[PDB]
């Protein structure tokens, strides 16, 4: 009801780190960012002892989390449960991803997401689709019976709920230029992935309408000699952006700072993240196989790589810590820029007033210690 | 002789930060980087209880610290000070600068390095002497040995005595100059490398006429220096030159007496200087030279300008070894490189130094 600042912390805005200054939030909103000492007399304040204070992280690739899987239970609380676990490693919003499934799937994530966010805004903010109309190629652990190419239908679909999907995942070099088109005009982000795109498929693909690139490095056409292939076409393509998931097993660190020198503010942090995280498990269904949590990694039964456990904090420590990236710019990758890329930024991704209160508090050794959301505070 | 090993600490070798890996050094030198778990069974190690190691921080711009001033006392010894001064911020390495009024005085510098760098190597690297002519060149060319490196202004000098002094060995560096944006970019033609104090007593950038940092900017192969106290130019500026300037950038401190030492005021070759909350002002409280020291610029670049610590310190060691062609020996650390190291922690303090190979406190 009153307003509450923040206080004592490194702020990163998104724009500057500030010491000794303050956040005053005023219900969902931030009010002002301001130098400590001007805080009006009896407001109410928060020491934050002296830690960390950016923008709550924003997760383009998560599958579940918490102990759950959105494929399975695909209902509105298996979102909910996961967007609390998000906070205890201080990401305030995500894309509840659904991985390639029935077309029946498909229509009741569509009512989960849609359920959710009548009830709840900015957390979950529309769904990531992921599949079906891949390449078998490229297929990862996404069934070789569900992948499918797009039928008019089910885009036509996928169109008509627009205001509940926020991105779609294809392999456009067997697909329809008309579907990604018809995509892009109803507000939905195309993003290229688990795709055996030539660099001049893909660059079409572009053309057409895509803008995005899910988990650079996996499932893609790798740039070769004679055939830059779809991490060729993404370096050649200034307005793309490319997620990627730092957890020291998908890609290797040194692909990620090369990564991010060609496409600087174009790469955005992904944790693409599985039932482990922000939990204790010993193992999962990752649709069909059995996926043990082996300290850290995800493997099937050989040890070969399952999936990921990534939390968001983690992939911006990483950055940090192994990558080589500033820490003010790994924030940013995990803020600003997804934020941008789902043209959610005009109100999330920054510190700034008029914007809403979705703050995360970290210290310095990448422990998160609070959040709050749309102005609720929480540990 | 045995060789030790360094061990429990983030190494940044300054191509890679390293993990759980020891650095084994034998004589004056590294003999390897291992991982942790390679050292021989009866190795003595040292313990550095997970602090950052770095190449130890060279400081290509100093005129004086702990107390005293290269300029008044122009001797081996006051050398000898500084460099002792130099090991509690990290600084292994350095250049004894000289504002030269006399010949006398220019004189006396050549000696004290001379006589210095006879007793100890990878220490000062050599003069830098600074200001204020034929006669004078002839001079400097013919001490070459301990000099490493000049700054003038071009547009006072023939192109020939520019070229001389490359061609001795010495590097010439663009500073406290009045050139426009052709005239610097003749002297590098000329074969100036190097800019003192980016910003500080040059040329300014104008829409019709870049000058000298216009000049800098746009002439990929001179290294600036940079002073980093937030005091000499604005952490903004810093950042932006970064962007341009990348590897050519190095960190400086053209630092004076207060820098490392509990100290009231001195004289700046001129007015006494005061030293008040860590800033050198007169009692009018202008800005009257830096206080700056190496481990304060990489902490300062880290924290304020946006920097990843591994550049930072790269500005701080393999960018100045490269500017004047030390790198071979100094400035990495890696097989074979000389064993000057630096280790800090989390908040920035220097707990230890190696000096060719000799261990500290
Ligand atoms: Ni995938
Ligand atoms: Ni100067």
Redesign the interface.
């Known amino acids: 009801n009153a307003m509450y600042a923040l206080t004592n912390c490194k702020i990163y805005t998104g724009n500057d ?1 500030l010491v000794k200054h303050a956040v005053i939030i005023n219900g969902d909103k931030i009010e002002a960012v301001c130098p400590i000492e001007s805080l009006p007399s009896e407001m109410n304040v928060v020491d934050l002892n002296g830690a960390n204070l950016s923008p709550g992280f924003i997760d383009l690739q998560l599958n579940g989390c918490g102990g759950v899987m959105f494929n399975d239970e695909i209902t509105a609380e298996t979102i909910d449960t996961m967007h609390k676990a998000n906070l205890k490693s201080g990401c305030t919003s995500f894309l509840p991803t659904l991985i390639t499934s029935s077309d029946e799937n498909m229509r009741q994530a569509i009512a989960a997401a849609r359920e959710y966010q009548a009830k709840y805004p900015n957390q979950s903010l529309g769904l990531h689709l992921e599949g079906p109309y891949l390449n078998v190629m490229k297929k990862g652990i996404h069934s070789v019976d569900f992948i499918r190419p797009s039928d008019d239908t089910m885009i036509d679909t996928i169109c008509a709920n627009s205001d509940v999907i926020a991105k779609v995942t294809l392999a456009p070099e067997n697909n329809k230029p008309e579907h990604i088109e018809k995509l892009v005009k109803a507000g939905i982000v195309v993003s290229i992935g688990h795709t055996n795109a030539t660099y001049s498929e893909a660059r079409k693909s572009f053309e057409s309408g895509i803008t995005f690139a899910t988990h650079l490095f996996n499932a893609m056409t790798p740039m070769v000699g004679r055939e830059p292939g779809v991490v060729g076409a993404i370096y050649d393509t200034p307005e793309v952006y490319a997620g990627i998931i730092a957890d020291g097993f998908h890609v290797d660190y040194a692909n990620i700072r090369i990564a991010h020198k060609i496409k600087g503010e174009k790469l955005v942090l992904v944790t693409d993240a599985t039932a482990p995280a922000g939990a204790e498990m010993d193992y999962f269904i990752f649709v069909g196989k059995k996926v043990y949590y082996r300290d850290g990694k995800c493997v099937d039964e050989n040890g070969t790589l399952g999936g990921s456990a990534l939390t968001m904090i983690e992939a911006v420590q990483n950055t ?1 810590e ?1 990558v ?3 820490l ?2 790994a924030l940013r990758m995990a803020t600003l820029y997804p934020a941008k890329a789902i043209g959610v930024d005009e109100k999330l991704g920054r510190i700034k007033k008029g914007m809403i209160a979705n703050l995360t508090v970290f210290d ?1 050794d990448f422990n998160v210690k609070a959040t709050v959301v749309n102005g609720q505070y929480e540990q």
């Open positions: 780190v940090v192994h080589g990236i500033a003010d710019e310095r």
